[PDB]
């Protein structure tokens, strides 16, 4: 939708080396604003964006206690799952949780999710109606029956449809200058002589936000996906993103190829040429 | 803000 808030939780067991490592991050759209790392020194939920720093001590004290208990729950899950799959305590395992909500143009609820993974594979997830569960294997069906008998889905829906949406609105308002911004891509093109008969054109897009972007190549105005390379979107480090797309062109006819950039800050796609 | 303490599997 128009905006979203998402939280990511990961626990990695360390058999014979200490308690599992717990890392939690929160994101509003493409911006991270909170973190927790069990190996870090603070042992608290820490801010990672300016607009969240204005929350009072009740916020930070409460969030610290909540993620800590969350890590404790994962400590129990890591051992329980070993019994579900009859696994030994000599190997390292990881659990991953992820939830959040999407909102529409009116900042009202649109979509919710809450999914759980074990060793990198889907384990159990809340369906789109926020009222049923999707179990992967036999072990997940035991978790499903327990969470159904505990009426867990009813309580998760109240967060995803309620608190999640309400506090997403709050963050969007407190961080309007940062979250409600849109940075159009800064574009340019480079040329690289591969040999006497071929040349590579690289179409650049930099300093854009949010990360959603599309780069396509065209020859004589028709789409051309052959001999085209498209790198995955990468973070610039200052809150923006980078992406480029390349194409191999017979030497002499580079003027027949155009690059097209589609982004939220461009009402019409930008066109890039070499000459 | 995060949800309440989750249930164990």
């Amino acid at each position, epitope marked *: 939708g128009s905006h979203s808030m998402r939280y990511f939780f990961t626990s990695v067991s360390r058999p014979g080396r200490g308690e599992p490592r717990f890392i939690a991050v929160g994101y509003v759209d493409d911006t991270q604003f909170v973190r927790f790392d069990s190996d870090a020194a603070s042992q608290r939920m820490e801010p990672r964006a300016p607009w969240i720093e204005q929350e009072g001590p009740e916020y930070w*004290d*409460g969030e610290t206690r*909540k993620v*800590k208990a969350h890590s404790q729950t994962h400590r129990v899950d890591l051992g329980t799952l070993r019994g579900y799959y009859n696994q030994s305590e000599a190997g390292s395992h990881t659990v991953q949780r992820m939830y959040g909500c999407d909102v529409g143009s009116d900042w009202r609820f649109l979509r919710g999710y809450h999914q759980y993974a074990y060793d990198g594979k889907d384990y159990i997830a809340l369906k789109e109606d926020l009222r049923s569960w999707t179990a992967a294997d036999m072990a997940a069906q035991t978790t499903k029956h327990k969470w159904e008998a505990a009426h867990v889905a009813e309580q998760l829906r*109240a*967060y995803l449809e*309620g608190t999640c949406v309400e506090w997403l609105r709050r963050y969007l308002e407190n961080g309007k200058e940062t979250l409600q911004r849109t940075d159009a891509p800064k574009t340019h093109m480079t040329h690289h002589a591969v040999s006497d008969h071929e040349a590579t054109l690289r179409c650049w897009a930099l300093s854009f936000y949010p990360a959603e972007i599309t780069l396509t190549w065209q020859r004589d105005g028709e789409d051309q996906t052959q001999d085209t390379e498209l790198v995955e979107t990468r973070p610039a480090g200052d809150g923006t993103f980078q992406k480029w797309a390349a194409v191999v062109v017979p030497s002499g006819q580079e003027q027949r190829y155009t690059c097209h950039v589609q982004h939220e800050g461009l009402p019409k796609p930008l066109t890039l040429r070499w000459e | 803000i995060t949800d*309440q*303490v989750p249930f164990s599997v």
Partner: T-cell receptor
Amino acid sequence: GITQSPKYLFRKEGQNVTLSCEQNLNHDAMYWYRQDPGQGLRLIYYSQIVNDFQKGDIAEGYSVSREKKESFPLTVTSAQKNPTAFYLCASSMGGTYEQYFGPGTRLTVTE
Amino acid sequence: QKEVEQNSGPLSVPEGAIASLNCTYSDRGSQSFFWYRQYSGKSPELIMSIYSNGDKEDGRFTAQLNKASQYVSLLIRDSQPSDSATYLCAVNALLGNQFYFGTGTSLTVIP
């Protein structure tokens, strides 16, 4: 479920008393409230997990310990000015979940 | 003010009629809403729990939630003598990881 002893206690002012509370519901959070006649509940102390506890609103004159997950003993010290109250113990799955109270203890302290 | 507020004044309703108890709260990431019953000299008993806007029916009970107006209510159908007690409103708080109780409303049905 959750129990607290004794149902009625009667002591003389100047010494400390220990109110017991135990639950086998596998609950991490445990709470101590007191209640006056015609009044509401007032939080004294609570614990999110073992080996930890946080002062409530009227913690002055009270102290708690959480050495084990199932026990949460409350101590009424001589510093508490109005120890006579109905004391209630509760536990829950977490800080934001519904709490289940114990039977309660009526403490009366006289000169 | 307080996080959870309900008029504690004694409410009297004719037996067999409808008994409605109101409760208003200050939103603190409030997501879960509960009703407790408490008889004289007894401990609070959980009787009702609601999580989404609308009416939740359970026997002669009916819990109503309107998060937009920050309002939780409880409706008792066919008021009986056993319904005379103090009803406590409880609202959780994801901000701070807390669980707040109201002061309670004493209800007595008249025969």
